[PDB]
Design a binder for these strands. Sequence first.
RNA 1: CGGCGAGUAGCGCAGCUUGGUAGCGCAACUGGUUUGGGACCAGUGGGUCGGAGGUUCGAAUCCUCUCUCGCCGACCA
RNA 2: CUUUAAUGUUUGAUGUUCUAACGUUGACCCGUAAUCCGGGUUGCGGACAGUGUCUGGUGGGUAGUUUGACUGGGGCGGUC
RNA 3: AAUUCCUUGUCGGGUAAGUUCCGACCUGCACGAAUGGCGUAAUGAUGGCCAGGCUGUCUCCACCCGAGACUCAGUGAAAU
RNA 4: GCUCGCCGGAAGACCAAGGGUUCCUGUCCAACGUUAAUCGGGGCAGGGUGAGUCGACCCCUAAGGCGAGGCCGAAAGGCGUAGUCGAUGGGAAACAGGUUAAUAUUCCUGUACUUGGUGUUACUGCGAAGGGGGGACGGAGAAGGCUAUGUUGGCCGGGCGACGGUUGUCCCGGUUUAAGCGUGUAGGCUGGUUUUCCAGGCAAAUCCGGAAAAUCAAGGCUGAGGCGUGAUGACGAGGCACUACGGUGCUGAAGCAACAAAUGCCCUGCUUCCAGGAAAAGCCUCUAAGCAUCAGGUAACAUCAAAUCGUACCCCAAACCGACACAGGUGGUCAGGUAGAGAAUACCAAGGCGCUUGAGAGAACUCGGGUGAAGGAACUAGGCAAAAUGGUGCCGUAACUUCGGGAGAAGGCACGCUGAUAUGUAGGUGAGGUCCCUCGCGGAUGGAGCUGAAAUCAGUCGAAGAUACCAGCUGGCUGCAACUGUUUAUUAAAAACACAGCACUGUGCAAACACGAAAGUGGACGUAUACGGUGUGACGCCUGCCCGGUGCCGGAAGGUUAAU
RNA 5: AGGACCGAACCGACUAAUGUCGAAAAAUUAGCGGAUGACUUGUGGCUGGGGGUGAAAGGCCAAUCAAACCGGGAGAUAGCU
RNA 6: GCUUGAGUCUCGUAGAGGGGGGUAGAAUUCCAGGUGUAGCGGUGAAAUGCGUAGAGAUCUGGAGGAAUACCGGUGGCGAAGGCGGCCCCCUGGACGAAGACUGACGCUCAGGUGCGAAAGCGUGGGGAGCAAACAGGAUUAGAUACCCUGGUAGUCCACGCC
Lengths: 271, 46
Amino acid sequence: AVVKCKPTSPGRRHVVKVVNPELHKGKPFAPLLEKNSKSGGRNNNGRITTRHIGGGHKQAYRIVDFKRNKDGIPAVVERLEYDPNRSANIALVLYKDGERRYILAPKGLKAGDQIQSGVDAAIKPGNTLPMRNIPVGSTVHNVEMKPGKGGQLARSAGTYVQIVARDGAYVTLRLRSGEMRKVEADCRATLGEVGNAEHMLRVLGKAGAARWRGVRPTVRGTAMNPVDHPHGGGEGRNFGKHPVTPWGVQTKGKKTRSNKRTDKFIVRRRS
Amino acid sequence: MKRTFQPSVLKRNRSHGFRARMATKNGRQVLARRRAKGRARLTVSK
RNA sequence: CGGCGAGUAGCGCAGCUUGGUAGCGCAACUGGUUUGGGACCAGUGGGUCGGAGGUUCGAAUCCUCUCUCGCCGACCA
RNA sequence: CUUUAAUGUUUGAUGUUCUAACGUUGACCCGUAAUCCGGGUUGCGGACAGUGUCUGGUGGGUAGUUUGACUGGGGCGGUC
RNA sequence: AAUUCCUUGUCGGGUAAGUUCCGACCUGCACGAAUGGCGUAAUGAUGGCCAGGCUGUCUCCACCCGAGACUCAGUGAAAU
RNA sequence: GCUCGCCGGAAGACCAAGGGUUCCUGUCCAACGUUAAUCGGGGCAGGGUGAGUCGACCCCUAAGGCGAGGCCGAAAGGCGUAGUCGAUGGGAAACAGGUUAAUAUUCCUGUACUUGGUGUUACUGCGAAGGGGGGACGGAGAAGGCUAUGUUGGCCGGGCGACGGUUGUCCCGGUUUAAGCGUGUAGGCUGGUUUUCCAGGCAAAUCCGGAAAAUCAAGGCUGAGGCGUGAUGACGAGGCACUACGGUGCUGAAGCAACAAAUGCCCUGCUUCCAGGAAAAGCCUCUAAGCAUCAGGUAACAUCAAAUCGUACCCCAAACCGACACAGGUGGUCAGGUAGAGAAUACCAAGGCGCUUGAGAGAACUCGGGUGAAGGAACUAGGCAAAAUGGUGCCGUAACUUCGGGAGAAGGCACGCUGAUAUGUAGGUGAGGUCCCUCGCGGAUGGAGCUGAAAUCAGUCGAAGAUACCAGCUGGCUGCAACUGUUUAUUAAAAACACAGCACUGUGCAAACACGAAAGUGGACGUAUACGGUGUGACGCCUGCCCGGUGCCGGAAGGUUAAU
RNA sequence: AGGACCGAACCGACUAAUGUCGAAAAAUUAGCGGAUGACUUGUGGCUGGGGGUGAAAGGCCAAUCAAACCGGGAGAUAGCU
RNA sequence: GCUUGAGUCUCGUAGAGGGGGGUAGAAUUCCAGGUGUAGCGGUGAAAUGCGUAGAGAUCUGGAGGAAUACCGGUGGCGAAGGCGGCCCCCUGGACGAAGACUGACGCUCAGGUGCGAAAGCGUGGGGAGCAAACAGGAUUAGAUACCCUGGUAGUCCACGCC
């Protein structure tokens, strides 16, 4: 449920746990389980690359099918699950004559439903289909980028991307960030929004809930001394500067998107 | 008040060892800087 | 005891680079308009630059020391 | 000369279409019992992108230094 | 006020006695909106203040156990 | 050798780390030991470490490391797939007694287990670098059943007393036994099974995953503790034979039940919650290429091995690390009795020790302590210290408040011990008989026996009954921080830092941003309900005004302008 | 249920005395905070000197830190005792 | 026991009654391009703001957004507050018509629970027009206003509060 935690003591005073009563309280379905070896901040050259981050409680990453290339075999959704990785919880779906597999729960599904991916399926919560054979003006998610990659677009909990128009052999997509883009019409996507759709107000409530999630404490730049971050130093909380990153680029400002190998495809950027 | 030389002879052999100093380039430099002086203590082998 | 800042009528200011004529806005006051104040529509009176100088072709102006009021620093062991 | 019409003929600007170098952290067999890579198909970008050299800009993210002297201690304000 | 030097600002209160302390005045030399304002239950090896308790902290020290000091034999350095 | 002291979740006993003869015997006392020394962890000499089963090696991985061909790199060298390494984890198996001057689960006595090899015989479809299953898991929290272990009694052996009484309700001592094997229980999960099929596991598949008719409600897996074989054997208080002062050798009774009882075991079991809880080999079944009488694998049995090294001693200390016979610092297991909620504390057991300078006198002064007449913070920078309350059960609990807290607000009430309730009740566990009896380690009933609160009265003693150890000072306001937390390891613990939250802003994926000449990885096997960065910092009441200047974010009219 | 409450082991180290050529190149003896959590510790890896890491003091990287250590440059140079 | 109270049951009839999904036209303010040039907008009159970096104007292609001209009539419903497109779903009340029927079950109701426009608030969506705030331009003796150019909270949806 969307429960409000009855505030006994400090540190239960602000917690709210957006929880499902029907997420299955048992186990991950083991044959889709590879482990993860934690690598907080440090690449294979050691040497902490990303700050701000660290360890926290152990995870066992779930192998999630994203391409959905079965294209013509019906699929019974067995149960939902909580793969702790993304935000968008996962539902184990077995197919007609065999293999059992995890897909993203698209918010409209309760377990037991039939779904089918392909170019020849219905228009329902949980069917994936390539955008040549799509209803225009819909609202979909899990969009691919190339016809065969598998998906990079709107797969975080609750979100969605609205197809707006057909550009002939191209399909333009209204992204939920403000920018919108143009991809060729032969990319594959699933109707509707993803599950865990009210994860947005998951308050943690306490230092404690963060540090076993993986976020690790970061100190303000005017706190530091000036040999450590350009804002550092100051006799009594004095900024006197213009807000830049650790390494120098001014933030709260300059739009550093300059990949240019992608500027062909943005129809209307974000104002 | 734990004191500094907190010993372990496996950590003294994975690091200061022979096979720790014969593999790379600048371990072999060390063994050549020692046997030019020519002393019986060239590594930590025991 | 010491820098920067000046004093132009009751009140507060341009005239001061590179000396040449004492103007200006709002008061006291008097009037037009209205039955009457105030306001608007306009004017009269109000100084020889705190003061003493020397200097000089004539000094508020050019400088120096004072009366007073601003302001800047008056720090280290 | 100001100002217009076409012609010959030479640059430069800008856009569409294209494939052939190049790009490909797209898929797919093979080397190979291998989410490395290389090789060949196929799809998509496409003369842009990336990089080389030259070049203005930006550049405390860094590096090298510089920040007078008499002075009734030094600083101040002078003086040079 | 943790900012207000100037000032013990001046009044109420607590004391027989109040530069700190609680409540306001406004004369903010120089509070005041995220270099965040005001308020805030709980919490704090926290910052002052007050009453009750309680005691050698004090008037004023008095005795008294035990380890050293001191004496003997053994051993026997160090700063300079 | 007697006597007295000290520790007893330790200064006791066993190990890893580490050290490397310090272990035992005979001798030596010149140096070493904060003195001596017939002494020692000091010197000389001899002597001491027995493994198929503990560990290591070994089969296999994790973080991670080298890293063939490679991509890259000015040389070096940086990164990485295949692979091959790396336990603080998974893979085979031993326990009881005795014994050495000194080692043990090693050797001798007894009972046996474990994985391989060969082959007589009986069978006969087996066989991966392949597939599947398992091994494969978290945190917390109770509660049920038991064992370690202890306690009381019975039995059994010896005793009855160096001053009063102690022939019995009396003192003291011992009442030990494993692995394995047979029977499977309290207890947990689970529907088995037969036929016919399947575009699933890169192919294949009599396996497994799925889909369908039949079929009755069972089979099975895991399983502390118990009960007998183990054991007419050993062990066993003690007394006797000998008497080398060490002691040597035979003999040796009882060996019971009940009350308790864990933090250990069933428990890799189960309820529940979000923060979603390691990978491969051993073992197990099923196929491919082959061989298909032969060869391989299964089962019974006989027989033969189990290479190597570590082990001595200390191991909360005089032996490791601290220049040292240093009040210091190091991690894991076992855990006794009486009061006790206990692993607090108090006093003791087994068991180790009396901290390698002793003997006097009893100045001032110093250090650690005890009480202190009357007074009570007068002292002082300040109640710093020191003092004092200090315990379970029952009541009685403010302003304020986020309604939880506050608050163990404050504040008082009874405590010992004997008898009576009752020759020790409630409650706990609970044999036989009896009865049905899926002939059982059953299930009801009955309750002997054995422990044992708590509670009420009388009465009695102290001056004081939580009597000692141990064991909350207390409220009235206010500044700052929301709060638990962290920091200057070694003069700074708070107002500093983080914090959940709020916001701005960047980021559309070969992401931005970073570490690297570069390859590359991190970010993220995540994809704008997410990521970076910045700022302020619970929730509550709120977020005024200036876009100048500095700087970003849009614009491309003009002026100006590098290279060529 | 709890970064819950009093409170041991353990982790830390606010208070006063001793020590301060000491028993110790920061500890002891009493009182003190946390004490199933943002927990402590055990072992084996990873990170590099204008670089590493940092719940951010310019603290920590072997008794040394506003740029560790050893060797080489190097008899650096010193107008100053 | 009664039926004229009140209430049931049976065919239907009219409607902006309520809640929920989607949907259609006109038209404004922007996004993009072509034709095209000194003015657009504005109220009394000006000046801010827009514009020769080519606006306004119109035409072509999209964007959401909110209101649903006309039908609209002191017209129909609701206890009230309030309700105006269409469409499908669910569903509430008023009333006529005659038969069968329970046979006073009625009226009111401090306590009480519930509903209740507008703004106002909390959390997450949203954004055209319009508009508190606010700014500048006039106006004015002053103008913290009426006017003008822009614009923020909000206006709107789900869901709690008020």
